[PDB]
Amino acid sequence: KPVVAIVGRPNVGKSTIFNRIAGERISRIYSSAEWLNYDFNLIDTGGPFLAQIRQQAEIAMDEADVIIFMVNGREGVTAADEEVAKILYRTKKPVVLAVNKLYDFYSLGFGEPYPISGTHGLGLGDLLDAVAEHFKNIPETKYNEEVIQFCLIGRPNVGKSSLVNAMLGEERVIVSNDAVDTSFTYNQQEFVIVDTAGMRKKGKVYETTEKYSVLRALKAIDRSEVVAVVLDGEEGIIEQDKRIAGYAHEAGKAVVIVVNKWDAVDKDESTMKEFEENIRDHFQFLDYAPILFMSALTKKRIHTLMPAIIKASENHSLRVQTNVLNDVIMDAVAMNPTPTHNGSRLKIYYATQVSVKPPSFVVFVNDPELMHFSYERFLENRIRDAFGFEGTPIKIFARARK
Ligand SMILES: Nc1nc2c(ncn2[C@@H]2O[C@H](COP(=O)(O)OP(=O)(O)CP(=O)(O)O)[C@@H](O)[C@H]2O)c(=O)[nH]1
């Protein structure tokens, strides 16, 4: 059922590898070979220089679910490879990097490079595990890539439906028209609210336990890129709130914290500040998440919601230039020298971004064991000051050369 495409510039070995993994055409589409302990389909995308590659990658991004990006080892990172790379940045679909005919392929921004040789198929098993690992996250409801998908989550009666209503009443919104999702544009940009139906549940059904509502909300997050955590300003914070937010975080989604029912709280300057501090103390792992106070009922500050979601989404998607990132790491190191761990002091040789949604970074080191979690936090903070990243978690992995 899953579909795999091979993308690269010409003379890299696409046809060899492709013919190797292709079984027979179906009736262009080929299914996978018999020798593979893996079931999937391939799509051929082959037949100016930048304009023909433009066609291929486009076709893959629409048709394929997982894309293999092929470069040439013996040559290396050619500027021609760097162009194809730039094209593929245009997709939220998974890309695995293959290096044919076989160390700053990391400096192409797709993470670990999988060496192969279409000779006696060396390295192919690792390549296919990476490719296949994505098959489970293949969305069931598929939207256009320009669409920004988000969900609202929070306990019974926080005002999810009401916040939605209030959002959709603004002059800037045009609502369209799975009978679970709501589509609309805002400043003519496309959005989908995941699983609005689930918010409108009772009225056809008695909720009798929360346990199914929880699990369904988890599937809505899996489907989103931004999660609005909505808290009741009147009744405060509870245990269930931490858990669902916990999941969102561990899943690497952008997060915005929404405090609804602000109208129903005794407000002076202090109460807002204390409620904010309260949230930072209960949700210690969400410091990157901004906090919006509003009221779905009075419409106070409700016009701040969509801008914040747009911003969290952008930061979730952001790609840094490597040169700037390395300036920033080395600046962090100068200001704050690295710790020892028994005679041996951590050294950082180089950093690259390996992926987006959420942004992830690899720093090449001395030895990964020497990098304390607290120093990791510190490097994360320095990257935040330099680039922004409000509204998204970020990941830093330490790896050894070599
Ligand atoms: N004071 C105040 N009350 C609100 C606000 N938003 C919603 N309410 C009230 O809270 C109750 C729940 O609103 P509702 O939109 O159904 O919350 P929900 O979370 O969508 C309901 P479910 O949990 O079933 O999905 C309603 O009585 C509504 O009038 C608000 O901003 N301020």
Swiss-Prot record:
Q: Name one Pfam family in it.
A: KH_dom-like
Q: Where is the EngA-type G domain?
A: 2-139, 148-317
Keyword Cell membrane among record annotations: no
Report a single Gene Ontology molecular function.
ribosome binding
Q: Which domain of life is it from?
A: Bacteria
Task: Please give the knockout or disruption phenotype noted for this protein.
Answer: Essential for growth, it cannot be disrupted. Depletion experiments show that cells become longer and abnormally curved, with nucleoid condensation. Cells have many fewer 70S ribosomes; the large ribosomal subunit is 45S and is missing proteins L16, L27, L36 and interacts with 2 large non-ribosomal proteins.
Residue ranges constituting the KH-like domain according to the UniProt record: 318-402
- The residues that hold GTP 1 are 8-15, 44-47, 100-102
| Record GO biological process | ribosome biogenesis
Identify the residues that bind GTP 2.
154-161, 195-199, 260-263
Write out the entry's keywords from A to Z.
GTP-binding, Nucleotide-binding, Repeat, Ribosome biogenesis
Family recorded in the similarity comment: Belongs to the TRAFAC class TrmE-Era-EngA-EngB-Septin-like GTPase superfamily. EngA (Der) GTPase family.
State how it assembles.
Cofractionates with the 70S ribosome; association is stabilized by the non-hydrolyzable GTP analog GMPPNP, and inhibited by GTP or GDP.
PANTHER family from the UniProt entry: GTPASE DER (PTHR43834:SF6)
The job of this chain, per UniProt, is described as: GTPase that plays an essential role in the late steps of ribosome biogenesis.
Other remarks on this protein: Estimated to be present at 7000 copies per cell.
- Record's protein name: GTPase Der
Protein species of origin: Bacillus subtilis (strain 168)
